[PDB]
Enzyme design. Structure first.
Site, PDB file in Angstrom:
ATOM      1  N   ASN B 106       0.807  -1.163  -0.068  1.00  0.00           N
ATOM      2  CA  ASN B 106      -0.018  -0.088   0.045  1.00  0.00           C
ATOM      3  C   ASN B 106       0.822   1.214   0.087  1.00  0.00           C
ATOM      4  O   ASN B 106       2.240   1.118   0.418  1.00  0.00           O
ATOM      5  CB  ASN B 106      -0.815   0.112   1.231  1.00  0.00           C
ATOM      6  CG  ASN B 106      -1.961   1.270   1.232  1.00  0.00           C
ATOM      7  OD1 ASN B 106      -2.526   1.346   0.537  1.00  0.00           O
ATOM      8  ND2 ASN B 106      -1.601   2.000   2.462  1.00  0.00           N
ATOM      9  N   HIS B 108       0.629   5.227   1.506  1.00  0.00           N
ATOM     10  CA  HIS B 108      -0.127   6.311   2.038  1.00  0.00           C
ATOM     11  C   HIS B 108       0.481   7.577   2.495  1.00  0.00           C
ATOM     12  O   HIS B 108       1.919   7.516   2.547  1.00  0.00           O
ATOM     13  CB  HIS B 108      -0.677   5.466   3.241  1.00  0.00           C
ATOM     14  CG  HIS B 108      -1.480   6.280   4.492  1.00  0.00           C
ATOM     15  ND1 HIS B 108      -2.765   6.407   4.533  1.00  0.00           N
ATOM     16  CD2 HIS B 108      -1.034   6.946   5.605  1.00  0.00           C
ATOM     17  CE1 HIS B 108      -2.824   7.095   5.441  1.00  0.00           C
ATOM     18  NE2 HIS B 108      -2.055   7.616   6.063  1.00  0.00           N
ATOM     19  N   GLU B 126      -2.745  -4.567  10.774  1.00  0.00           N
ATOM     20  CA  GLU B 126      -2.790  -3.141  11.821  1.00  0.00           C
ATOM     21  C   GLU B 126      -2.948  -1.927  10.581  1.00  0.00           C
ATOM     22  O   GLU B 126      -2.150  -2.145  10.039  1.00  0.00           O
ATOM     23  CB  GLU B 126      -1.504  -3.083  12.674  1.00  0.00           C
ATOM     24  CG  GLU B 126      -1.319  -4.476  13.507  1.00  0.00           C
ATOM     25  CD  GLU B 126      -0.939  -5.694  13.040  1.00  0.00           C
ATOM     26  OE1 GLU B 126      -1.947  -6.394  12.495  1.00  0.00           O
ATOM     27  OE2 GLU B 126       0.207  -6.365  13.075  1.00  0.00           O
ATOM     28  N   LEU B 127      -4.242  -1.780  10.539  1.00  0.00           N
ATOM     29  CA  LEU B 127      -4.584  -0.953   9.522  1.00  0.00           C
ATOM     30  C   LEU B 127      -3.632   0.396   9.472  1.00  0.00           C
ATOM     31  O   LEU B 127      -3.145   0.964  10.613  1.00  0.00           O
ATOM     32  CB  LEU B 127      -5.989  -0.089   9.950  1.00  0.00           C
ATOM     33  CG  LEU B 127      -6.776   0.285   8.855  1.00  0.00           C
ATOM     34  CD1 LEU B 127      -8.185  -0.088   9.491  1.00  0.00           C
ATOM     35  CD2 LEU B 127      -6.396   1.592   8.439  1.00  0.00           C
ATOM     36  N   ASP B 128      -2.930   0.799   8.561  1.00  0.00           N
ATOM     37  CA  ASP B 128      -2.060   1.771   8.123  1.00  0.00           C
ATOM     38  C   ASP B 128      -0.549   1.245   8.529  1.00  0.00           C
ATOM     39  O   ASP B 128       0.652   1.762   8.023  1.00  0.00           O
ATOM     40  CB  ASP B 128      -2.032   2.936   8.702  1.00  0.00           C
ATOM     41  CG  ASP B 128      -3.233   3.934   7.927  1.00  0.00           C
ATOM     42  OD1 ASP B 128      -4.368   3.639   8.142  1.00  0.00           O
ATOM     43  OD2 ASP B 128      -2.971   4.680   7.164  1.00  0.00           O
TER      44      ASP B 128
HETATM   45  N1  LIG Z   1      -7.164  -3.346   6.377  1.00  0.00           N
HETATM   46  C1  LIG Z   1      -6.637  -2.507   5.628  1.00  0.00           C
HETATM   47  N2  LIG Z   1      -7.191  -2.059   4.217  1.00  0.00           N
HETATM   48  C2  LIG Z   1      -6.553  -1.282   3.435  1.00  0.00           C
HETATM   49  N3  LIG Z   1      -7.367  -0.940   2.539  1.00  0.00           N
HETATM   50  C3  LIG Z   1      -5.181  -0.777   3.900  1.00  0.00           C
HETATM   51  C4  LIG Z   1      -4.730   0.188   2.982  1.00  0.00           C
HETATM   52  C5  LIG Z   1      -5.273   1.603   2.795  1.00  0.00           C
HETATM   53  C6  LIG Z   1      -5.241   2.306   4.076  1.00  0.00           C
HETATM   54  N4  LIG Z   1      -5.815   3.842   3.869  1.00  0.00           N
HETATM   55  C7  LIG Z   1      -5.069   4.608   3.431  1.00  0.00           C
HETATM   56  O1  LIG Z   1      -4.001   4.340   3.293  1.00  0.00           O
HETATM   57  C8  LIG Z   1      -5.755   6.027   3.305  1.00  0.00           C
HETATM   58  S1  LIG Z   1      -4.514   7.179   2.615  1.00  0.00           S
HETATM   59  C9  LIG Z   1      -4.355   6.442   0.748  1.00  0.00           C
HETATM   60  C10 LIG Z   1      -3.789   7.389  -0.184  1.00  0.00           C
HETATM   61  O2  LIG Z   1      -4.457   8.283  -0.616  1.00  0.00           O
HETATM   62  N5  LIG Z   1      -2.631   7.391  -0.846  1.00  0.00           N
HETATM   63  C11 LIG Z   1      -2.113   8.101  -1.676  1.00  0.00           C
HETATM   64  C12 LIG Z   1      -2.265   7.864  -3.011  1.00  0.00           C
HETATM   65  C13 LIG Z   1      -3.722   8.363  -3.798  1.00  0.00           C
HETATM   66  C14 LIG Z   1      -3.952   7.910  -5.198  1.00  0.00           C
HETATM   67  O3  LIG Z   1      -3.453   8.738  -6.128  1.00  0.00           O
HETATM   68  P1  LIG Z   1      -3.674   8.607  -7.759  1.00  0.00           P
HETATM   69  O4  LIG Z   1      -5.064   8.109  -7.599  1.00  0.00           O
HETATM   70  O5  LIG Z   1      -3.431   9.653  -8.484  1.00  0.00           O
HETATM   71  O6  LIG Z   1      -2.834   7.318  -7.822  1.00  0.00           O
HETATM   72  C15 LIG Z   1      -7.120   3.790   4.200  1.00  0.00           C
HETATM   73  C16 LIG Z   1      -7.571   3.796   5.515  1.00  0.00           C
HETATM   74  C17 LIG Z   1      -8.844   3.883   5.724  1.00  0.00           C
HETATM   75  C18 LIG Z   1      -9.911   4.278   4.790  1.00  0.00           C
HETATM   76  C19 LIG Z   1     -11.214   4.335   5.176  1.00  0.00           C
HETATM   77  O7  LIG Z   1     -11.596   4.523   6.330  1.00  0.00           O
HETATM   78  N6  LIG Z   1     -12.016   4.774   4.097  1.00  0.00           N
HETATM   79  C20 LIG Z   1     -13.384   4.890   4.138  1.00  0.00           C
HETATM   80  C21 LIG Z   1     -13.972   3.537   4.527  1.00  0.00           C
HETATM   81  C22 LIG Z   1     -13.941   2.547   3.409  1.00  0.00           C
HETATM   82  C23 LIG Z   1     -14.611   1.235   3.790  1.00  0.00           C
HETATM   83  O8  LIG Z   1     -13.905   0.530   4.423  1.00  0.00           O
HETATM   84  O9  LIG Z   1     -15.573   0.917   3.511  1.00  0.00           O
HETATM   85  C24 LIG Z   1     -14.095   6.256   4.909  1.00  0.00           C
HETATM   86  O10 LIG Z   1     -14.761   6.063   6.055  1.00  0.00           O
HETATM   87  O11 LIG Z   1     -13.960   7.291   4.356  1.00  0.00           O
HETATM   88  C25 LIG Z   1      -9.207   4.342   3.620  1.00  0.00           C
HETATM   89  C26 LIG Z   1      -8.105   3.954   3.198  1.00  0.00           C
HETATM   90  C27 LIG Z   1      -4.732  -1.034   4.890  1.00  0.00           C
HETATM   91  O12 LIG Z   1      -3.576  -0.630   5.357  1.00  0.00           O
HETATM   92  N7  LIG Z   1      -5.155  -1.966   5.768  1.00  0.00           N
END
Ligand SMILES: Nc1nc(N)c(CCCN(C(=O)CSCC(=O)NCCCCOP(=O)(O)O)c2ccc(C(=O)N[C@@H](CCC(=O)O)C(=O)O)cc2)c(=O)[nH]1
Ligand SMILES: Nc1nc(N)c(CCCN(C(=O)CSCC(=O)NCCCCOP(=O)(O)O)c2ccc(C(=O)N[C@@H](CCC(=O)O)C(=O)O)cc2)c(=O)[nH]1
Lengths: 204, 193
Positions: B106, B108, B126-128
């Site tokens: 991933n 971030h 562990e998310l993130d």
């Molecule tokens: N279990 C688990 N799942 C994962 N997917 C991940 C990976 C993603 C974690 N994460 C992020 O990293 C957010 S910052 C990402 C980012 O923008 N990176 C830069 C590139 C951008 C592209 O740029 P370009 O498109 O131009 O390439 C993230 C965290 C929380 C939400 C969240 O709560 N998201 C939602 C809830 C979604 C749901 O679960 O249904 C909310 O409530 O809003 C969303 C993402 C993880 O580590 N663990």
């Protein structure tokens, strides 16, 4: 009701369907669009209309049956009431055809057999397009509506083709709307409109 | 070496990785791109690159579980050696994460005045969290705006993520016991460099 459209190319016919659903001429929703070609411009028409796309490429699969099993799997997620083939260039297997029997449609640019189309050589006559229920008789399950496209002296292949496409765009939304209004059914390898059996060449 | 990339939006990172595979800098092939938003512009970047695309929208699924079951199912059709999350905005369930253990990456935009940067890490439950592989700190000065920060963090994202993926393609990067290990050497908390 839920429409799933299958394409392989440009998608001009898909677009006529999307717009007819926009202006409430078809009582329905295009829920997903499926392609067997990853570059198909029809996928960009779907993206801009916000419709979910899926592309299944033949090399990715082990056998024809494997492809159709997954194609069925993915189409059914959208609970289709019709699956419309609009320039879908692949033959669908017996298991696929029976799975959507009576709610699988197709459009071919021909009437029933002879048609001066191609342009591999204006003109004489025989040119058109028909929408038909898809059956295992490849390219020849029951016709629902056809449209003869007038040929003229001052016509080119692009003139004829464009004219055919303009008629495809009129008839395919019409047929899908009669289907959406509960007026078109298939039984006994025959197309039925309002309980009346259509003649071999469709309506009228 | 098969790459499946998961996106939700613009897809600039996806473009940076397609680019690096072309240029043989990543000895791998992006085989499919998944999106959870039907309108995502990265889908158009994939169409032009000739890459298979699948959009799974959450409203079509009855539950989180059902969604992730179909995501695994459709991803495994492309036999991924790595699954790259490149702006994918949805939390992946324990089951999915388990399923691609040591193969899910991933990016971030925050390392883990000027507090700004981006980091690539293995995804562990562990998310993130999950171990960092490579980071890049991005200084911000007075004058440049939040958008200029973003633009600078993005230039770095496009540099480090094709680079981690390059190491993973060459069998040089592995995850074991919630630590990343490049060429056997255990990477420190902030990754390489
Ligand atoms: N279990 C688990 N799942 C994962 N997917 C991940 C990976 C993603 C974690 N994460 C992020 O990293 C957010 S910052 C990402 C980012 O923008 N990176 C830069 C590139 C951008 C592209 O740029 P370009 O498109 O131009 O390439 C993230 C965290 C929380 C939400 C969240 O709560 N998201 C939602 C809830 C979604 C749901 O679960 O249904 C909310 O409530 O809003 C969303 C993402 C993880 O580590 N663990
Ligand atoms: N079982 C079954 N399967 C069907 N698909 C059909 C459909 C009909 C047969 N079919 C067609 O007529 C072609 S599509 C109609 C058309 O011309 N539309 C133009 C206007 C819309 C586009 O324009 P716009 O994109 O802008 O809307 C067709 C032609 C060639 C092949 C074929 O051999 N195709 C391949 C083999 C493919 C395979 O099976 O793997 C080959 O070897 O060449 C397969 C089917 C059927 O009746 N039964």
């Amino acid at each position: 009701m839920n429409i799933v459209v299958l394409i392989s190319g440009n998608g001009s016919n898909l677009q006529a369907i999307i717009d007819a659903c926009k202006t409430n001429k078809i009582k329905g929703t295009v829920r997903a669009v499926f392609s067997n070609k990853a570059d198909a411009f029809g996928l960009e028409r779907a993206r801009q209309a916000g419709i979910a796309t899926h592309t299944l490429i033949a090399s990715a699969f082990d056998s024809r049956e494997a492809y159709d099993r997954e194609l069925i799997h993915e189409i059914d997620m959208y609970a289709p009431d019709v699956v419309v083939l609009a320039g879908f260039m692949r033959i669908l297997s017996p298991a696929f055809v029976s799975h959507y029997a009576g709610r699988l449609l197709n459009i071919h640019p021909s009437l029933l057999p002879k048609y001066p189309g191609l342009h591999t050589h204006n003109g004489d006559e025989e040119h058109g397009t028909s929408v038909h229920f898809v059956t295992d008789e490849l390219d020849g399950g029951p016709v629902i509506l056809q449209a003869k496209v007038p040929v003229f002296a001052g016509d080119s292949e692009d003139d004829i083709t464009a004219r055919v496409q303009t008629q495809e765009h009129a008839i395919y939304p019409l047929v899908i709307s009669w289907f959406a209004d509960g007026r078109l059914k298939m039984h006994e390898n025959a197309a039925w409109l309002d309980g009346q059996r259509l003649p071999p060449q469709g309506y009228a």
